Amino acid sequence: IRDAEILRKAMKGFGTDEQAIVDVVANRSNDQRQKIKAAFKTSYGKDLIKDLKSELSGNMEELILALFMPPTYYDAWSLRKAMQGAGTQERVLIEILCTRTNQEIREIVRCYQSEFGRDLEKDIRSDTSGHFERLLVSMCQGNRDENQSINHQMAQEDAQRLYQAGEGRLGTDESCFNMILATRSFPQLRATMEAYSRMANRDLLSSVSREFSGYVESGLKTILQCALNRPAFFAERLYYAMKGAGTDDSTLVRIVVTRSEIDLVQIKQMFAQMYQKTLGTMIAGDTSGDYRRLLLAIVGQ
Ligand SMILES: [Ca+2]
Ligand SMILES: [Ca+2]
Ligand SMILES: [Ca+2]
Numbered sequence: 001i002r003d004a005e006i007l008r009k010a011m012k013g014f015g016t017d018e019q020a021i022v023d024v025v026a027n028r029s030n031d032q033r034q035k036i037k038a039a040f041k042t043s044y045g046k047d048l049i050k051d052l053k054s055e056l057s058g059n060m061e062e063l064i065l066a067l068f069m070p071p072t073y074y075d076a077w078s079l080r081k082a083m084q085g086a087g088t089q090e091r092v093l094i095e096i097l098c099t100r101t102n103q104e105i106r107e108i109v110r111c112y113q114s115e116f117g118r119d120l121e122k123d124i125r126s127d128t129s130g131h132f133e134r135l136l137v138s139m140c141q142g143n144r145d146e147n148q149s150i151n152h153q154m155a156q157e158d159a160q161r162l163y164q165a166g167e168g169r170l171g172t173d174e175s176c177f178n179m180i181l182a183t184r185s186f187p188q189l190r191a192t193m194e195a196y197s198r199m200a201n202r203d204l205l206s207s208v209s210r211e212f213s214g215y216v217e218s219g220l221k222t223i224l225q226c227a228l229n230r231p232a233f234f235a236e237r238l239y240y241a242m243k244g245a246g247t248d249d250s251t252l253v254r255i256v257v258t259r260s261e262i263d264l265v266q267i268k269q270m271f272a273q274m275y276q277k278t279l280g281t282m283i284a285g286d287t288s289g290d291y292r293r294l295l296l297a298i299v300g301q
């Protein structure tokens with residue numbers, strides 16, 4: 001109620017107080033940002049998101065818009081917009097569908113139905129094909145093994161099978177990589193890759209690059225890279241987003257927002273090590289305006 005007043009106050013009159021908007025949104029959780037959305041509608045009978053769309057613009061607007069969406073609905077929205085129309089940004093389908101957990105995936109499948117009236121998996125099969133469709137479909141099941149204990153005989157056998165399905169033959173037996181990489185738990189996949197390094201004399205990630213290509217290779221490496229160090233995978237994705245002239249603002253916003261309340265800290269510590277440069281320094285050089293002030297506040301203190 002008090003928070004809803006400030007945003008209304010900061011939008012009232014000519015112009016906008018963008019600093020006040022940041023001081024509220026960046027210092028409030030997502031659960032709290034939903035209760036501010038609700039307190040706003042009751043106090044004034046207007047939607048806050050629409051009033052924010054009228055008085056913000058550009059990267060500031062989309063970063064604030066992302067920050068007010070519930071985490072589940074945001075992912076589901078992000079998946080719909082990645083398939084909407086002709087074309088597909090399979091990078092977005094990999095970043096979500098290959099990195100979210102079983103719990104997160106099942107909420108998306110529920111929210112995707114109850115909000116757009118569409119079948120998530122059905123949408124995936126139409127916008128994709130090949131072994132990538134199969135990989136994303138497995139991802140959509142949200143059915144990865146959850147036992148976090150290591151089964152050693154399984155790790156051995158699995159690696160041997162992965163060895164025989166790719167390197168040990170001409171061509172590749174893709175569904176074998178689909179099976180283990182989509183069914184095995186993350187500590188189990190880590191044991192699989194350790195068994196695969198000694199027997200193959202070449203780590204599992206390189207073999208994926210050799211026997212696979214395209215978005216399947218990207219998707220498969222994503223799962224493996226997440227099994228090793230999921231925060232480090234995002235760090236690399238954020239590094240790619242701001243390297244070069246300009247910024248991939250869609251990605252930089254999406255990763256900062258979606259992982260802000262999950263594992264952002266570990267992403268920063270990873271990013272610092274992999275690049276000898278804080279994630280804040282990279283952003284502060286690549287962004288400006290209030291849009292920068294919001295991004296730094298979210299990483300923050
Ligand atoms: Ca309040
Ligand atoms: Ca105004
Ligand atoms: Ca202003």
Ligand SMILES: [Ca+2]
């Ligand atoms: Ca509080």
Ligand SMILES: [Ca+2]
Binds near residue numbers: 053054058
């Ligand atoms: Ca606008």
Ligand SMILES: [Ca+2]
Binds near residue numbers: 083085086087127
């Ligand atoms: Ca389409």
Ligand SMILES: [Ca+2]
Binds near residue numbers: 087088089090
């Ligand atoms: Ca594409």
Ligand SMILES: [Ca+2]
Binds near residue numbers: 125128129
């Ligand atoms: Ca198809």
Ligand SMILES: [Ca+2]
Binds near residue numbers: 243245246
């Ligand atoms: Ca740049």
